[PDB]
């Protein structure tokens, strides 16, 4: 009886390994057939259209006190910008960066100035004696609220000043009409500093004198706003990855239009007739205006793949090939 | 508006709130788990405030399938349990939901399980002796009616056989009402007790609360407080005399040690929580007999690794009027109930309270067993005969006394098949008076094992 | 062959459909020594089963504000910084169903035996709670273990937990493999109520030990109904931690369908040593013996799954035989005393008795069953009703009298009875006796029919008598099997046959018996 | 036991010859089937006619 | 492309890398030391990923003279040893560099030391016995083909002679090979072993891997896996039977605990690594038989405090299948190879794996030698004349039995010139069966010393 | 002051055992159940006294 | 490409002096000394 | 390579330099000795282990068998022979004769 069951188990190994041979040959033959169909630009246009129509059928980095205080600070900046002009805004931004360098270097001062305290008038007094002669009054009027509010760590004051200086600089792009251009140049710098591991790691120089990184950007890397945003960011970089920080600049820059960014992957050259539909269905899916960062690549040939926030919708010949080969018996 | 989950660490859940909506300590917070076969409403108790409207909670159901960012609603009151005369007969989890039929008790008066213990003006010492009818307990460790009593022991020495014996000695004839707390003990024993109390017809006057082994440390500690909050209702509002059997009150401090390491408080000695004595105090003081109204607590206390120095046993040793220290050594001899006579103690063993003839005998017996234990280091090497004759006389009666502190219990019938015996206090004192005066030194040691009283000793001696 | 082979892949291809529903992808931000921290995954459940690019799985334990502290299961060597991690959308769960019978699987419920993929009925979550004090009923029907000592003195009822605690190389595995082999006499009968099915969970055992067990179970035919879960000594702490839980989660799916299950855990000390490792890698501060405070909530949550269900829940059961290795018989150690306090008794195997050649080495007095005696069949309960007490009083009487010149005749008769009962209870490995043969073998000794037989022949005397009574007079064995009772008319018919066999027998030295 | 072990070994050798011979034969038929099954899978992987 | 050192703390080095080039863990990385007096190619093994593209490494060589910001190059594979027949005759370090001739072996195939054990379906399902041909070993402590044998040695107690013997047995009986894992070998006795194996001319069939005590706990841990990766090449790719010596397997465990403490992991139990039983698993589960070929192992094992319950010996004895013990009390009698017949043991000595006749003969030899090891106190204090005729008739057999466990062996060919002898298992069983039944009592003890089986006993005895 | 008495709003007292740069580590001498984040605390002006 | 030429220029731009930032109990921590 | 375990009881029992022979060991052994020291002292570890067994019988020296009584009284003299005053190191040419 054990021999009889052992022969049936031997047959079971034969018919199973036969099916692995047939399955591997069938998926590899299918991969050749679909790659050859996929080669046509009409077939890719039908694949992205089929994907799009299928999809049509279908401060949070901060603790509570800091989140509330930053929301109030940005709400005051919206009032200060309501009377501002570009030749004032570029000065407000360079001056807010300059005090962010002071607070970052004089860590004793920052550890007192950030002190969470409801009776905040002494802290305003310290800022008043230290800054009132050094810098323009509109910066003091914004720093008064930055100090008088409550922060969850000593870092979160430097994070709020840096973010306010960045907002002040973005406002020049908004008033001048360059908002789309600076977005495109920030995604350009975001992708190139991701593809260039030598220069971006060297721009992460928070262990080195920052003026060397500022001079590097001036020589290597254009709209003067995008240059200024990069130079401000490397100055205040504090051990973040440079490419990842430039991506956080671009995410903030779209967030000032109320929208969010979806990165997109396609075979090549997704046409405007695709882009208007893709943005419209993404807008339905996520309930917001959107922008697409087109990261075209041949290794993900056929279909379309997209990522936004934490989710991905990922329909491509290469992803669906992995789904087909892994499902084999 | 309401709170949101922020962080999860097994049974500990950290949640934030709007700036003004922060809950108090010990509030019950509901949260939703919304996956598959484990979708459940989750009861959280608030243990700490961390700053910036964060509060750290303990979870009364397993947190598996909980998600960060789910809404958390503050009920604005502590965990509350049903109390009332209609609580007796039923079986509850820590949260006060009836296991037998979940719709029961939701219309009753509900009391918050967190309460201040009775103020010092209302406490008074209890000194009335409780007749149990076990020889070693009534003689050497006399239990206190309205006191706190404990059964310390290792693993598998018979702590729970003594609790289900004491249910048959006391709760069957006791004119009051019994509460049973299952704190971290076997679910199998909860079922074998529930079907026994039904067959004995005692169930009509007892409420059972169970927070057995299979439950997360939040409810495995909060079950003791829930069961006690039923007992405090029977004591205070119904004016009854109460029994409160807790088994096993070491699992209360153990579940406290688990949550403390997850709350991230620094570990104490041998990895217990700090506040081991304050958490144990907050339980053990509430279970007291105020002036007009008695509560006869009885508590099994596990002793881990048989280490009678361990901080949890050493902390609970202060709270007790009688302590019955069970021992692996006495268990290995088969001398059930396995009470170690020299370690066990009672506060009412004083001649002013038990009378001279009891106290004289209970010091002669302890002197003898003490002298035998202080000869044990020689006995182990040489055996008996190398002792002096005044010591050999003593050890021959000490070994008889030691075996005569054994008894055939009512609870032992499920293992030995023999019936159970009850020995009155007077026949207990007389027998040990005669033994210590030497009347029985001609009878063999095997004549004294597992036997109820003098008449049954005589019969067993004549069987040999 | 070819028609079904081509058809199965044609149906697979026809079924294959787009997986385009969106999922949260996170990235590893830290890895080391068995754990990894994942950033992102804002919608992950606690105890979700994450997956990593090498096909490796992990459990999402510590969900922080901006990270998810996973434990890695399997080859954590394949995990590194920046790797994409994705949700499976399932809580920590394993496939379950009848298709696991005869398979060897890793703790994730994937086949390690090198045979085909398993046709699982459904998934079950490992952390689903045990049946409460109102769902259970009192243990009432027995597992025959087929060991004379255990079924006589420490009877394992269905839905009992019975700790096979001992030292290393003491036959703990050999008692459990004898227990699993014995059930084949019930598996051949098709009714799900006699028919027990088994799970054997190997935690931290040598691969050659698991292969030896797998082969001994094929020799006995136990692999028709046994599932092995293998977490061999090479596998990372994550697998050795889960191997008991997935063993119980395989079992629970049968228990709730109203089948009877036996789980063997071999060895829960190597799960405790693995959960200690996971806890200390996570820096959770140690308690006694360096175990974390919740090492009790490891074993208790695992062993409370084992129960007997009521008729309201289909009347099934699961019987848990956890093993523990002590060290030099320190039964008062921490992990031993945790599991002695959870389980419903222990079969303490003593290495001194095992080296003297008393096998199995059941150390009575310290061995006991606290549920047992309800489920033990009436004939066995009549014959063995004194045998536990008679052996404990023999061990003390011998330890005394070995250093005395002489003793009274009643004590000497009790000693010689005890020494012959010890020679009566021992038995060889992989020889499980049917209960109808065990009760007769214990009748010989307890009623004193061995008193004419010398200690050098007693094991042979019982071995020839139990074949004689299997060859003629078989109405004794058949009667015991078909009515569970050693009736008066079976007792007199047995004593009429034992005396005919005693005159037919001759010791290796001395005379014929009477 | 020795007679039955010899029979089991003979049966195992007969199965090894039968399954090796069959395995070559079925793989020829399966190669033709593989072209048809691959063309069907090429439709399923694209989500359209091919 | 390459990385940079950014922290150094003794043996531990942290290396920063570019976002795409971060090595997977257990890769080997090369670093420079350029200070003239300490110039090195420093080898690092990757232990953890600290996040932010930073990798925690443990250094295989002293980190003295490392500079922050020196370049670190990833080799893209694990620590890899040379493997081939060409490693026979040579001595290596734990990194696969030769000590006798530097740059030897770099042309060979290199195997990564971190590879899984055999797949579950490749293991053998029954323990075949190893016929080593040693009378004492085959009879009293049968060794296991693909199992691990503990070897409790000592100072001068023939351990190095039994090693040279067991190398000759596997090389000349089985056509096999040996590998010697010098785990923390004292550099003196590592040189003394190298020159002794060279003088025996066994070195030509052995590969030595020395992880000297000079080295940080990185290599003293990895040397055991390096030697096992040479043995795994001989088992898998050549298909030879192998004998992997380890000396000392406690120093592997210890070096593992020192790396764990260096990595800042919290200690476990008596202060070991938490990973202990898993990384002892990674070494020991990999010593096994597959596809009809095997790696037998002899492991010299230290036992701290003489505590056989200490987690390091206890995790070691959870694996190994036989225990050989050498005794000065037997070596001083000239009873080479000096295996203690009673302290040594094996798990194969049961009548299921060995025949009933073998089990019976070994149990009787043990009984006779146990009686004599009890009577040796009387022999020494009172002299032989104090014993009875039955006890002197036993001692006559016992003296001859312990002599007949001695053997002329291929290690002793170096000194005596007489060839070493192999005794078949069946001849060994039959010889001790006849000897324990007294069939040679009329021969003097000198007739049984250093003799190659029963036909050779007749030859010595008639010539004496 | 170090070891000053602090009045919490439930009448309950505590003692300032640690003094950090922006925070005071107070032990509560009484029923701590009434204590929660965000409520006022008054200094007594008095070192720990009875 | 140009990043490597810039990194070479940066490395060319970079006795050495440190300064004690902490001292206690027989230890002193020194900031700077990049080539120590 | 070896250990000269000094013990505080042997130091108080008068046995200075207090080396606990029979747990002290040298793994190098005889190779570290001149031939005259090997021939003279090789039996010394056997005589002092035999005395370390017989020393329990010091209370019964008359009853003990005479062939081992001549090992016990030898052993006591070999323990006295190994006592030595500090700052008096013997040249090897002297301690060969002293052990002889």
UniProtKB/Swiss-Prot annotation, chain A:
Membrane association type: Single-pass membrane protein
Any one GO cellular component localisation term in the record: proton-transporting ATP synthase complex
Extra remark beyond the main annotation: Binds 2-aminothiazole antibiotics, which are antitubercular agents.
The UniProt record lists the keyword Transferase: no
Descriptive protein name: ATP synthase subunit b-delta
GO MF annotation: an example: proton-transporting ATP synthase activity, rotational mechanism
Residues shown, of full length: 100 to 444 of 445
Main localization (coarse): membrane
Region (ATP synthase subunit delta): 59-329
Family according to the record: In the N-terminal section; belongs to the ATPase B chain family.
Location in the cell: Cell membrane
Gene: atpFH
């Amino acid at each position: 009886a054990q021999g009889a069951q052992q022969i049936q188990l031997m047959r079971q190994q034969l018919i199973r390994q036969l099916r692995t041979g047939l399955g591997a040959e069938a998926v590899n033959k299918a991969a050749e057939i679909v790659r050859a169909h996929v080669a046509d630009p009409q077939a890719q246009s039908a694949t992205v259209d089929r994907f799009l129509s299928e999809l049509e059928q279908m401060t949070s980095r901060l603790r509570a006190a800091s989140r509330q205080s930053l929301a109030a600070l940005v709400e005051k900046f919206d009032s200060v910008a309501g009377g501002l002009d570009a030749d004032g805004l570029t000065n407000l931004a360079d001056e807010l960066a300059s005090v962010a360098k002071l607070l970052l270097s004089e860590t004793a001062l920052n550890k007192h100035l950030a002190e969470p305290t409801d009776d905040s008038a002494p802290k305003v007094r310290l800022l008043e004696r230290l800054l009132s002669d050094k810098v323009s009054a509109t910066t003091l009027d914004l720093l008064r609220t930055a100090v008088s509010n409550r922060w969850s760590t000593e870092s979160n004051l430097i994070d709020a000043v840096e973010h306010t200086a960045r907002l002040a600089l973005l406002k020049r792009a908004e008033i001048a009409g360059e908002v789309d251009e600076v977005e495109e140049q920030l995604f350009r710098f975001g992708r190139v500093l991701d593809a260039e591991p030598r220069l971006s790691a060297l721009l992460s120089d928070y262990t080195t004198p920052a003026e060397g990184r500022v001079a590097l950007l001036d020589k290597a890397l254009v709209n003067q706003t995008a240059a200024a945003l990069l130079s401000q960011t490397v100055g205040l970089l504090r051990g973040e990855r440079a490419d990842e920080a430039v991506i956080d600049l671009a995410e903030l820059a779209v967030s000032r239009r109320g929208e969010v960014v979806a990165h997109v992957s396609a075979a090549a050259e997704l046409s405007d007739a695709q882009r208007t539909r893709l943005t419209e269905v993404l807008s339905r899916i996520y309930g917001r205006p959107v922008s697409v960062q087109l990261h075209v690549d041949p290794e993900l040939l056929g279909g379309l793949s997209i990522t936004v926030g934490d989710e991905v919708i990922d329909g491509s010949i290469a992803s669906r090939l992995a789904a087909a080969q892994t499902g084999l018996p | 508006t309401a709170g949101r989950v922020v962080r999860i660490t097994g049974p500990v859940v950290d949640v934030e709130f709007p700036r003004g909506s922060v809950p108090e300590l010990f509030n019950a917070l509901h949260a939703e788990i919304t996956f598959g076969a484990l979708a459940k409403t989750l009861t959280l108790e608030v243990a700490q405030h961390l700053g910036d409207s964060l509060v750290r909670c303990i979870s009364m159901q397993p947190t598996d399938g909980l998600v960060r960012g789910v809404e958390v609603t503050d009920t604005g009151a502590s965990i509350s349990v049903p109390v009332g005369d209609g609580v007796k007969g039923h079986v509850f989890n820590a949260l006060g939901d009836c296991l037998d039929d979940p719709g029961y008790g939701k219309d009753f008066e509900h009391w918050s399980i967190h309460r201040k213990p009775p103020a010092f003006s209302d406490l008074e010492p209890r000194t009335e002796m409780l007749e149990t009818g076990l020889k070693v307990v009534d003689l050497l460790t006399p239990y206190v009616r309205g006191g706190k009593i404990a059964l310390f022991g290792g693993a598998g020495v018979g702590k729970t056989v003594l609790i289900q014996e004491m249910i048959n000695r006391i709760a069957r004839n006791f004119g009051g009402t019994s509460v049973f707390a299952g704190v971290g003990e076997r679910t199998r024993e909860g079922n074998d007790l529930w079907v026994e109390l039904a067959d004995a017809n005692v169930l009509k006057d007892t409420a059972l609360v169970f927070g057995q082994m299979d439950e997360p440390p939040g409810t495995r500690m909060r079950v003791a407080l829930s069961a006690l909050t039923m007992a405090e209702f029977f004591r205070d509002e119904q004016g009854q005399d109460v029994l409160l059997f807790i088994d096993n009150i070491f699992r209360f401090t153990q579940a406290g040690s688990e949550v403390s390491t997850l709350l991230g408080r620094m570990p104490s000695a041998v990895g217990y929580q700090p506040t081991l004595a304050d958490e144990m105090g907050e339980l053990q003081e509430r279970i007291t007999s105020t002036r007009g109204r008695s509560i006869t607590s009885m508590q099994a206390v596990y002793v881990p690794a048989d280490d009678y120095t361990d901080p949890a046993p050493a902390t609970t040793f202060a709270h007790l009027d009688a302590t019955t220290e069970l021992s692996r050594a006495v268990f290995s001899k088969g001398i059930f109930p396995a009470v170690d006579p020299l370690a066990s103690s009672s506060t009412i063993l004083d001649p002013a309270i038990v009378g001279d003839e009891h106290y004289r005998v209970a010091q002669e017996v302890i002197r003898i067993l003490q002298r035998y234990k202080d000869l044990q280091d020689i006995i182990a090497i040489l055996g008996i005969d190398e002792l002096s004759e005044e010591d050999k006389q003593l050890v021959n009666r000490a070994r008889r006394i030691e075996r005569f502190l054994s008894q055939n219990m009512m609870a032992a019938e499920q293992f030995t098949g023999q019936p159970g015996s009850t020995v009155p206090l007077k026949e207990t004192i007389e027998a040990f008076d005669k033994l210590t005066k030497g009347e029985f030194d001609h009878l063999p040691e095997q004549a004294f094992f597992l036997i109820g009283g003098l008449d049954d000793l005589a019969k067993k001696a004549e069987s040999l | 062959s070819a028609a079904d082979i081509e058809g199965a892949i044609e149906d697979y291809v026809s079924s294959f459909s787009a997986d385009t529903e969106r999922e949260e992808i996170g990235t590893v931000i830290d890895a080391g020594d068995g754990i990894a921290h994942v950033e992102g995954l804002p919608s992950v459940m606690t105890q979700e089963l994450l997956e990593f690019p090498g096909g490796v799985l992990g459990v999402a334990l510590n969900l922080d504000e901006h990270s998810v502290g996973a434990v890695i299961l399997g080859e954590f060597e394949k995990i590194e910084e920046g790797q994409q991690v994705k949700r499976t959308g399932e809580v920590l769960s394993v496939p379950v169903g009848d298709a696991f019978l005869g398979r060897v699987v890793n703790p994730l419920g994937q086949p390690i035996d090198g045979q085909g993929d398993i046709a699982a009925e459904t998934r079950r979550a490992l952390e689903l709670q045990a049946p409460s004090v109102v769902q259970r009923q009192s243990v009432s029907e027995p597992l025959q273990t087929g060991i004379k000592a255990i079924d006589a003195m420490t009877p394992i009822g269905r839905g009992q937990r019975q700790l096979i605690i001992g030292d290393r190389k003491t036959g703990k595995t050999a008692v459990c493999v004898d227990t699993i082999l014995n059930q084949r006499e019930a598996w051949l009968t098709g009714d799900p109520k006699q028919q027990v099915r088994c799970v054997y969970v190997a935690i931290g055992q040598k691969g050659t030990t698991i292969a030896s067990v797998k082969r001994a179970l094929e020799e006995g035919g136990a692999m028709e109904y046994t599932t092995i879960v293998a977490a061999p000594a090479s596998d990372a702490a994550g697998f050795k931690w889960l191997a008991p839980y997935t063993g119980s989660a395989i079992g629970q799916h049968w228990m709730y369908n109203g089948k009877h299950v036996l789980i063997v855990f071999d060895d829960l000390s190597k799960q405790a040593d693995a959960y200690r490792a996971i806890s200390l890698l996570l820096r959770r501060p140690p308690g006694r013996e360096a175990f974390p405070g919740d090492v009790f909530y490891l074993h208790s949550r695992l062993l409370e799954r084992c129960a007997k269900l009521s008729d309201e829940l289909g009347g099934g059961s699961m019987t848990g035989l956890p093993i523990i290795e002590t060290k030099a018989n320190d039964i008062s150690a921490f992990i031993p005393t945790n599991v002695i306090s959870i389980t419903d008794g222990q079969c303490f195997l003593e290495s001194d008795l095992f080296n003297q050649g008393v096998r199995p080495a059941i150390n009575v007095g310290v061995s006991v069953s606290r549920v047992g005696g309800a489920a033990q069949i009436k004939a066995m309960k009549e014959v063995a009703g004194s045998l536990r007490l008679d052996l404990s009083q023999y061990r003390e009487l011998e330890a005394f009298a070995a250093f005395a010149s002489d003793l009274d005749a009643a004590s000497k008769a009790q000693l010689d009875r005890g020494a012959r009962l010890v020679e009566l209870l021992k038995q060889p490995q992989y020889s499980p006796l049917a209960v109808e043969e065990q009760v007769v073998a214990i009748f010989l000794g307890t009623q004193g029919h061995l008193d004419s037989v010398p200690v050098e022949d007693v094991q042979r005397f019982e071995s020839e008598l139990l074949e004689h009574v299997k060859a003629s007079h078989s109405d004794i064995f058949d009667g015991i099997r078909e009515t569970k009772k050693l009736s008066e008319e079976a007792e007199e018919k047995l004593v009429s046959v034992i005396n005919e066999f005693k005159k037919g027998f001759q010791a290796s030295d001395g005379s014929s018996v009477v | 036991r020795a007679q039955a072990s010899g029979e089991v070994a003979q049966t195992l050798t007969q199965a090894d010859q039968q399954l090796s011979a069959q395995g070559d034969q079925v793989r020829s038929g399966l190669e033709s089937s593989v072209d048809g099954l691959s063309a069907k899978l090429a439709s399923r992987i694209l989500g359209v006619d091919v």
